Amino acid sequence: STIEEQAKTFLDKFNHEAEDLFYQSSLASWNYNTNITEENVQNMNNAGDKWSAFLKEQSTLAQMYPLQEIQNLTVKLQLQALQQNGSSVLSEDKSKRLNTILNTMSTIYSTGKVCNPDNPQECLLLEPGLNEIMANSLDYNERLWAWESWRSEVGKQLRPLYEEYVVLKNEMARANHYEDYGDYWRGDYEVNGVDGYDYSRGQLIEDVEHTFEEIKPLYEHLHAYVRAKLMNAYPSYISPIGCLPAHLLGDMWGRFWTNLYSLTVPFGQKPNIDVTDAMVDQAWDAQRIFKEAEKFFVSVGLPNMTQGFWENSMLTDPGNVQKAVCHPTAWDLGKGDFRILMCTKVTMDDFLTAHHEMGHIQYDMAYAAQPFLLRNGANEGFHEAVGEIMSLSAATPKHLKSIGLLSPDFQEDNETEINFLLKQALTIVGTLPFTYMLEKWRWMVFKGEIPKDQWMKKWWEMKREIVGVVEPVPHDETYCDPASLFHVSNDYSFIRYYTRTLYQFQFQEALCQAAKHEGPLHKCDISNSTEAGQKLFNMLRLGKSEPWTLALENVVGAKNMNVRPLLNYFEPLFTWLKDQNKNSFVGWSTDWSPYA
């Protein structure tokens, strides 16, 4: 009869057939990931082509229902999600060119192999050969060689490809009534039609700058401390007044600073909180790790894992004969099928990753009552944030003592909390200026603020201004230094890590206030608290049905992302860094004083 009922029946049929087809595609992807064989690759490609053709046909059929004659918010949200053209608005030649460019960037990044000139008989791939050198070497010229040679090969291959990529993506985005591709990415946080809780695409950049302006003193003190410690490690390369050399940050790109914990430890004489040896002594299997994680999630009041989870998940590496992807991934295959694909070792990192992926599984289970096209996070930040809060809670020494993994006579003094907070800052705080600088640079590239001949002169200028990292030698416009990273070369949004980092500590403060913890925020554990789990599950059950601003009101009581929980989390470390930086100079100079 009416347009709204027609759209509701169309959405119901859509949902019904979509769930089954997504199940088939996800099961084919699972069979590829647990069994790398050519027929599984062919089945995955066939299922993906069927899924994409079905999404094309439902996008073609959804547009015939006009939006303004529908008053129900959930129906309007699903129709808005379905009616997006995607690449279909672009011409077939340019769409084929864009798909070819994305595939060849994927092959260039995945099969990029670089080794030393005059020794070409064997070379090391993108990850295993070079990751260990970047994370463990202490030699200046070896890291400089690896960094400059990999950015030479990858940038000189990818620069014309990226120049075509920006033009094609801007054409697709302006064909979809967006300002640029950056506006297309910022439209994920756009809330329209809700009174008071509306969020605009232009408000996101202002909120990111407003939060980063409060990030900046803590990052300046951390940068000064890491600069002083790297001056101790490398005597003559690092200047007291200048930026850090780029190849010394412990990773390939500077994404994380967590590989500098050995060099920048405050109290090496004090012990670590490593519980690996205790699990080795008690012979803890990975099944016991996941059962302890399930005990953690039932302690907070969340539902326990299904029988199909224990039957159908691969929680151990299969062997030499059978090949599988080693990356830990939680799979919501559809129809109540939830699995974890992780090659779990007996380490603290795999235990925290098991908690993180089971948090992903709990988030997927919570919105199982929702319709299929609303089965997502309210934004891209919440989905990772609900795993990162489990990674926060499981890593606490109180949780390790509660489950018996830590000795009951372990002395928790201030020095171990300071060095633990410094490790968490090197992991968590250090990625924030890199993320903000990369996303702001990509937004200015898509917006056309930076011409193609001036991409890199601005970029290093941004890195000195924001990240406080100086180039070893200057790079001209033949280089493509951003696109050596996985997310930018393979068309992924990058602001999800910034939003995840802030939502992580906002959720942590909200659940610790729910659990009535009376001490420091980093000493807080959310186990045994039914009310904290209920407050979590109230937001978790919504999925994408409600705006992320209303969900954040449901958790923390605020209508916007906030930076104060992060500063409250690291406040003992902030006071300690302010005490330790009395003689040294906080802040950096953009001049060429260390090396150029």
């Binding site: 009869s1 019904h16 089954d20 088939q24 099961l27 039957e311 159908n312 129809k335 109540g336 939830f338």
Partner: protein, 99 residues
């Protein structure tokens, strides 16, 4: 995937109690006539449940048998079985033989 089990997803009105609908006529959700083709606003009533063993417990197939008991003015003949206490003779007992 077992596509042999189906369910009626649409119909203009709700069913009466103990009604069976086996019609395969195209559901008309819009003003336009379907004319037997599953085009715009016109969908097929019966949809399969792709029952796979790896499904969740809320999606696994369940066989349901509903027994309906009615009493009508005809003589009731479907009676539940009665038992037979071991016959005792030569004693003063309370006997119940066929009512």
């Amino acid at each position: 995937g077992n596509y042999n089990y189906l369910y009626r997803l649409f119909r203009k009105s709700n069913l009466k109690p103990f009604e069976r609908d086996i019609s395969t006529e195209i559901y008309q959700a819009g003003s336009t006539p379907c004319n037997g083709v599953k085009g715009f606003n016109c969908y097929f009533p019966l949809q399969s449940y792709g029952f796979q063993p790896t499904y969740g417990v809320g999606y696994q197939p369940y066989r349901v048998v509903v027994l309906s008991f009615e009493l009508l003015h005809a003589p009731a003949t479907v009676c539940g079985p009665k038992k037979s206490t071991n016959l005792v003779k030569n004693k003063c007992v309370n006997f119940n033989f066929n009512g």
